[PDB]
Structure formats: C-alpha cells, structure tokens
Design a protein around this nucleic acid. Structure first.
Ligand SMILES: Nc1ccn([C@H]2CC[C@@H](COP(=O)(O)OP(=O)(O)OP(=O)(O)O)O2)c(=O)n1
Ligand SMILES: [Mg+2]
Ligand SMILES: [Mg+2]
Length: 324
DNA sequence: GGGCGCCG
DNA sequence: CGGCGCC
C-alpha cells in the first residue's frame, strides 16, 4: 500500500551508506530526516519538485528523488554492492591498539572477527594483545563509586613514597560524569619543574609502586612523562580491568596540565583553536603569545585555570561544563 | 590543537 | 626514523 514506501526505502538505504562508507553524518542526518518527513506526508509523492516543497528535503534530495523516479535505478546507489570490508574494519578498530591502518591490514589478511583475532594473536603487537586480552573489560564504563576507590588507592600510595607528590584525577571524572571511560591522573612534584625537564624517575617510581601492589597490572607504555596501562580493583572471590593513564606535569606548569587533562577533548579543541584566533597558542604546558612572524613568544605566567581563560577572552567554565 | 611513546 | 594509536 504505503505511497512513498518505495522512496523512503531508498532514502534510508542511502543514509546508511553515507553513515558507514563515510563519516558524512551531516549527509546521513538529512537523509533520514527527510525520509522521515516524506514519510509522514499523506499524499503520493509524484514529482521530486513537489518533494522540495516539504521541509527537510531540498535540491540535492529532490534530485536523488528524480533519478529514482524515472528509473528505480540510482547508479550511485547501485555502486553500493562494494560492501563488507567497511563493516568489519571498524569493528576491529574497537580494539584498543587497532587503528584504521592496522585494521585494514588485518582485514586484508582475512582477520576480521573477534574470534579471528584471538586466533591470530601472533600478528598483534603488544598493545593490541592487551586490548585484545581484556576486550570485554575495556567496553565497560567505570562507575563513579569505583573511581572513587581508585582515587583513593592512588592517592594514598602516592603519599607513601613522598607526600610532596601531587596527584590529580582529571578527564571525565573531574568533569563530574557518573561513569568514566578510564582513569586519568595528573601527577606532580615540586622537585620537578620547568627547569630540569628530567627526572623520568618520579613517574617511574610511582608506577612501580602501584605496580608492586597489584594495581597496575599491565603496561602499555612508559615514557619519562606519560604512562598508560591496565589496572584493577581488588576483592574476595572479580573487578574488571581498567584503563589507566598517568601523566607527569612539571609542578610549575600544573594549570596547563590540569586544563588539558580535564578535557573534554572537544573542549580543548575549541579552546586551543581559539587561542589562536586571539594570537596565543596553548599546550599542556603553557600559553605563550604567539608571535607576528608565527613563532612562540615567552610563556605567560599562569596561577590558575581562570587566567588561561582570561587570556583568550573567555568566560571561565567549570569542569562540569567543559563538555565542549 | 598540540604532543608522547612505540612500532618495524 | 617516520607513522601510528592515543592522550
Ligand atoms: N584527543 C584529546 C584527548 C584528550 N585531550 C584530553 C581530554 C582529557 C584527556 C582524555 O581523556 P579520555 O579518557 O580520552 O577522556 P575522558 O574525559 O577521560 O573520557 P572517558 O570517559 O572516555 O575516559 O585528554 C585532548 O586535548 N585531546
Ligand atoms: Mg577518563
Ligand atoms: Mg584516557
């Protein structure tokens, strides 16, 4: 029965291609949107020119409409049958360590399932191995109360080695969310500052410590600044493996760090992006005027997150507000 | 946007 | 050493 059936069908097929074969969210979005609106319409759609009228649809859609009208065809649309690589690839990407590039290669060699991975372990680099090892684990968000305990344990043991050590937990957590992807933690130490730019050792000790207590349980990397690894809560008879990140910022550049580690990522993007519009360039370490020629001037002093915002002419926004 | 570590 | 995956 349904008049515009035929069309809406196409339309929807179309959006999902746009959705997957691309990023083309904007496209896909109008796409469905439209199919939706033509769909609510109570008259048979005859002319694409009629369609246009209806809100949601426009030129580009109306065209696609036409080509369908005369002939069920849609050469573009016919093209579609290319399929399957794309489904599987992305999937693989869900694997921590697996980027689009290693995902491709993995698919080309026929590895393109979860099951398959497990079978082709030998092809995986270490990180991948882990992502793979703790796969199901990595898909669960940490709940507030958990982080809590973790905040605790980190907090504590940090003190034991030195109580001069400062540890702040950023990212989601700090922005107040109810569930957090991982645990992100800023670490600082006054012995360490913009003048020395050394002491990998501080971080170093600390991971070993947590390590030596069965907290961290794996290691994805260990720089003289960064640190990503797995960790886990304890119990009697167990808690899911979590992703952990430590970053050591020279005690003197704590604020740039804090801002940056709090995110959100989008926020940072907009913000950093903005500093520029204003003439300064911001990194986890500093905010320094950015010179006429296009080179970084000396770094403006910072005494609190507020000041960063003051510089780019922006209203301070609480962490909980830095969503974007 | 701006940058850290590891791959091979 | 680039480039990758990640933050
Ligand atoms: N591409 C990125 C990623 C992060 N940052 C910052 C934002 C905070 C931290 C990223 O931590 P994530 O754990 O990626 O984000 P989150 O806020 O912790 O989110 P989740 O809930 O997923 O852990 O690095 C940035 O400037 N650019
Ligand atoms: Mg987080
Ligand atoms: Mg993280």
């Amino acid at each position: 029965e349904t008049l515009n059936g035929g069309i809406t069908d196409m339309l929807v097929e179309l959006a999902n291609f746009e959705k997957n074969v691309s990023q083309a969210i904007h496209k896909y979005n109008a796409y469905r949107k439209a199919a939706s609106v033509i769909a609510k319409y109570p008259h048979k759609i005859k002319s694409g020119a009629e369609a246009k009228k209806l809100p949601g649809v426009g030129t580009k859609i109306a065209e696609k409409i036409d080509e369908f009208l005369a002939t069920g065809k849609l050469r573009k649309l016919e093209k579609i049958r290319q399929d399957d690589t794309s489904s599987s690839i992305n999937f693989l990407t869900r694997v921590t360590g697996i980027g689009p590039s290693a995902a491709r290669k993995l698919v080309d060699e026929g590895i393109k399932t979860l099951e398959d991975l497990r079978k082709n372990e030998d092809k995986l680099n270490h990180h991948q191995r882990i992502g793979l090892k703790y796969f199901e684990d990595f898909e669960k968000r940490i709940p507030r109360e958990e982080m809590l305990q973790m905040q605790d344990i980190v907090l504590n043991e940090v003190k034991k080695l030195d109580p001069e050590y400062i540890a702040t937990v950023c990212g989601s957590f700090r922005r107040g969310a109810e569930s957090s992807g991982d645990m992100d933690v800023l670490l600082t130490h006054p012995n360490f500052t913009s003048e020395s730019s050394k002491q990998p050792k501080l971080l170093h000790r600390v991971v070993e410590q947590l390590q030596k207590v069965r907290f961290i349980t794996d290691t994805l990397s260990k720089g003289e600044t960064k640190f990503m690894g797995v960790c886990q809560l304890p119990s009697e008879n167990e808690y899911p493996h979590r992703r952990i990140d430590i970053r050591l910022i020279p005690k003197d550049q704590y604020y740039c760090g804090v801002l940056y580690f709090t995110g959100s990522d989008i926020f940072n993007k907009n913000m950093r992006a903005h500093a520029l519009e204003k003439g300064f360039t911001i990194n986890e370490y500093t905010i320094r005027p950015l010179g006429v020629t296009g080179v970084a001037g000396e770094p403006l002093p910072v005494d609190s997150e507020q000041d960063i915002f003051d510089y780019i002419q922006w209203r301070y926004r609480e962490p909980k507000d830095r969503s974007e």
